[PDB]
Amino acid sequence: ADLEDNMETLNDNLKVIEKADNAAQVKDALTKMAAAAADAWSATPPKLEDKSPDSPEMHDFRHGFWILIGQIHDALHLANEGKVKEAQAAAEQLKTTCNACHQKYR
Amino acid sequence: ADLEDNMETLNDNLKVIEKADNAAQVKDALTKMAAAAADAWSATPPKLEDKSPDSPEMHDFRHGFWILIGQIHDALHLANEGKVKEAQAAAEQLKTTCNACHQKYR
Amino acid sequence: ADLEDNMETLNDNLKVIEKADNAAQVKDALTKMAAAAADAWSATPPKLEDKSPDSPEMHDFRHGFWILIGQIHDALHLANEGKVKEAQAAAEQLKTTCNACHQKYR
Amino acid sequence: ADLEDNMETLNDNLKVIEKADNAAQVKDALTKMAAAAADAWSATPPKLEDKSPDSPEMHDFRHGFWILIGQIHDALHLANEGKVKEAQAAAEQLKTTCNACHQKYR
């Protein structure tokens, strides 16, 4: 999938997590986000098209995906443990990673 | 790319890191490993064809890529710091992750 | 050190990172934060004095320190790479961990 | 506790996990390992007594504790999920971290 599709998948499922009542819902949404974030890894954002594929900027771009992937990973464990509220809070917290990357690169 | 290509990329660059003489070579190889691992995320292994895409087995399979991706991430920081030997050591230690997944799923 | 002293160390160095001009200042402050957070691990917060040392609650409390330690770890790599701004951003972002734990346990 | 005691704690509980029959035994063991690892953070190893407390070598020493702590953290989540065998395998795998640090610093 393209960057925009992966971004909408990320966006859609974050809201699913907010409105969710149960672990399964959170679980499912986080799984989809993990796949979206991993697939986003190879993308070149439009503001970085003029940069070398292995530039410092591109390195920093992809680092944000590492952070987001790590966070989804942990939130998923929480939801697997049945810690719904705390997985939802981890989801709220990862928005900081979404925002930080958007502020620099979007 | 498919699973097999990602796996060759992973294997090829691990050997490149072993033979490397400077941090640029390690850095370049780890970057290629991270892309390969991230791209591998969505793959279904032949041994798990018969399992649901959202099965416990498939979750455990993808978990190994989380572990791999985290370790590459960290090793790349070490290489960026010019810590060639310790980045090469981190790379040798990664093999545990490679092996553990192969033993169960390959 | 006590929980309070570790908490002040954490507080003080966070501000040091905000005002910092170079990577060495940030590195030094994160190093101090890492030791404070690791030393905090064994503490029982006043709100949880009545809970068993290996209770659900106490596990969740210490989980927040795993999260914080992980974040400092990564931020320190960024500072080591000379990525001052992004290390400072990483430091602003880990405030979410600080606050999440306080909201629940302070 | 001192370095030796923390190392004994780490060693004893690793064996407990190997012999374990259920998730509770592995959970309990990993919990103790986490505390021992976090307490070990501040220690100076006999081989690095002559180095500055904020030396490059001391930084690399403590870095291995970060990686150990992260692995215990993850292994604990697996045990929490009731994935006993997988938690026991994550425990086997972190021996790589134990050994890597001993090779350089013990």
Ligand code: HEM
């Ligand atoms: C879970 C957190 C995230 C959420 C909820 C999210 C969601 C979104 C949304 C709704 C958009 C609007 C455009 C669209 O429809 O795709 C977008 C765009 C974008 N995001 Fe994110 N995103 C997240 C994480 C990230 C991260 C970590 C990065 C960078 C490493 C990033 C980089 C971008 C870029 C470059 C665009 C513009 C794409 C384009 O216009 O071609 N996002 N994202």
Ligand code: HEM
């Ligand atoms: C740096 C670590 C790794 C290395 C060097 C590595 C290396 C390889 C190599 C050389 C192959 C054979 C190439 C081929 O398939 O034609 C392979 C296959 C495979 N690997 Fe890995 N691998 C690594 C990590 C992983 C991880 C973490 C997993 C699972 C989480 C995994 C799962 C698999 C699977 C399922 C196959 C079979 C694909 C097929 O033959 O169709 N590998 N790997």
Ligand code: HEM
């Ligand atoms: C870098 C992030 C953090 C900062 C800057 C911070 C800061 C503080 C400060 C300034 C205090 C007041 C203590 C005093 O006045 O001496 C405090 C107390 C406290 N903090 Fe944190 N904290 C952080 C992270 C955490 C985390 C991760 C946890 C738990 C997982 C936590 C749990 C507590 C508790 C239980 C208290 C109350 C102890 C008391 O009664 O004094 N904090 N913190």
Ligand code: HEM
């Ligand atoms: C879970 C993995 C680990 C296990 C099972 C383990 C086990 C041990 C054992 C059995 C000893 C013998 C010392 C004694 O009993 O007096 C020891 C010592 C030591 N270990 Fe580890 N350890 C682990 C992790 C680590 C790590 C990650 C580091 C480095 C950061 C490390 C550094 C050392 C050092 C420096 C000593 C020497 C202690 C002294 O002589 O005062 N160990 N460890």
Ligand SMILES: [Zn+2]
């Ligand atoms: Zn966790």
Ligand SMILES: [Zn+2]
């Ligand atoms: Zn590291």
Ligand SMILES: [Zn+2]
């Ligand atoms: Zn990083």
Ligand SMILES: [Zn+2]
């Ligand atoms: Zn995990």
